[PDB]
């Protein structure tokens, strides 16, 4: 399957005193591997997965230099956009950026991203051709013009198709024991009476990676979509994910209902019955 490297940056202005709070996190697929937090003491990019500790001291110095430079760029952008939106100095605002790349099953570049939000709304995004920009509003047209005139898409494309893919491949190999392992969900059903005449069946999917999964209920082999309660996929805290789906049914009729679990770690979907 494909794999992804992504960085997620959040900078929030502090109008009462001081410079913006900046947090950067890096992921390979659904695994966080580095962080930086401007409020922390180290002022360093820090490891958050064991396989990134394979990198030498030069890696940590370089990523710290680059992440601190990114923090300054977000501080500048918060100031600039406050002006573009004619906002006062009294309010807190947020600039978010995400960028990164995917490789295919063929181990080659598949796609790149580089996009921004202001106050939680799309602002400007590099299009899929990595050669042009999408501006969400008229403020962002200013940035789009500036970036077209500066021809900055070329250097972004160079990073996204080149350097980004090269380092993603390195990380995948270094981290292969986890990054290239799928953890199929451990599945089971629980049964709870809610009265003498009805019961809840809850289908659990536990300890799975990556996070993408589908859980669905059927009754007599046809979907039972409207009567399903489904919680959002949630982190276990140990790097794996959890989900459940439940249906209330007449007690004595449990055997009509099946839970269907689809996940990349399962060569065929699983069917569970009480």
């Amino acid at each position: 399957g494909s794999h992804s490297m992504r960085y997620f940056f959040t900078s929030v202005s502090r109008p009462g005193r001081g410079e913006p709070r900046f947090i950067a996190v890096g992921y390979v697929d659904d695994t966080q591997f580095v962080r930086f937090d401007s409020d922390a003491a180290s002022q360093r990019m820090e490891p958050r997965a064991p396989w990134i500790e394979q990198e030498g001291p030069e890696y940590w110095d370089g990523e710290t230099r680059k992440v601190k430079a990114h923090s300054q760029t977000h501080r500048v952008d918060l100031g600039t956009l406050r002006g573009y939106y004619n906002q006062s100095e009294a309010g807190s605002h947020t600039v978010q950026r995400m960028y990164g790349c995917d490789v295919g099953s063929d181990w080659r570049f598949l796609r790149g991203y580089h996009q921004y939000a202001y106050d939680g709304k799309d602002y400007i995004a590099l299009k899929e051709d990595l050669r042009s920009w999408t501006a969400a509003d008229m403020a962002a047209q200013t940035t789009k013009h500036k970036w077209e005139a500066a021809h900055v898409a070329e250097q972004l494309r160079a990073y996204l198709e080149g350097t980004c893919v090269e380092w993603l491949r390195r990380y995948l190999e270094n981290g292969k024991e986890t990054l290239q392992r799928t953890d199929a969900p451990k599945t089971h059903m629980t049964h709870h009476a809610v009265s003498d005449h009805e019961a809840t069946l809850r289908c659990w999917a536990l300890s799975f990676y990556p996070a993408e999964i589908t859980l669905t209920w059927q009754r007599d082999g046809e979907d039972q979509t409207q009567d399903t309660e489904l919680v959002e996929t949630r982190p276990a805290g140990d790097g794996t994910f959890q989900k459940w789906a439940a249906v209330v049914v007449p007690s004595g009729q449990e055997q009509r209902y099946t839970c269907h679990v689809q996940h990349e770690g399962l060569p065929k979907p699983l069917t569970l019955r009480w």
């Binding site: 997620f8 959040t10 929030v12 947090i23 996190v25 992921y27 966080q32 962080r35 937090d37 958050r48 807190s92 947020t94 978010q96 995400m98 939000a117 106050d119 939680g120 709304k121 799309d122 629980t190 709870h192 809850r202 919680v231 959002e232 949630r234 982190p235 276990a236 805290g237 140990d238 959890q242």
Partner: protein, 97 residues
């Protein structure tokens, strides 16, 4: 502004006397400044940790707050969340199932 969605759950099935982890997963919120506490019988648990702030495709934030705990029969837990989008703190009881 978007309000936080809350899930409160244990990492492993709760078995009284067996060590576990209590999680409160907050997601779908904006802006990112948020206060999350885990409560035991109404009282704030100290030294609760949290994941590093990240966000989803729609730009909304998510955080996991967590602590080691040993469930017992009598103890009650909950997660308390305050956010600019809320008039007062939202508190969700941990239901073991």
């Amino acid at each position: 502004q978007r309000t936080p969605k809350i899930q409160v759950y244990s990492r492993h099935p709760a078995e009284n006397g067996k060590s576990n982890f209590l999680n409160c997963y907050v997601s779908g919120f904006h802006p990112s400044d948020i206060e999350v506490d885990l409560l035991k019988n109404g009282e704030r648990i100290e030294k609760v940790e949290h994941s590093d702030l990240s966000f989803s495709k729609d730009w909304s934030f998510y955080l996991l707050y967590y602590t080691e705990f040993t469930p017992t029969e009598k103890d009650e837990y909950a997660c308390r969340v305050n956010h600019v989008t809320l008039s007062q703190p939202k508190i969700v009881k941990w239901d073991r199932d």
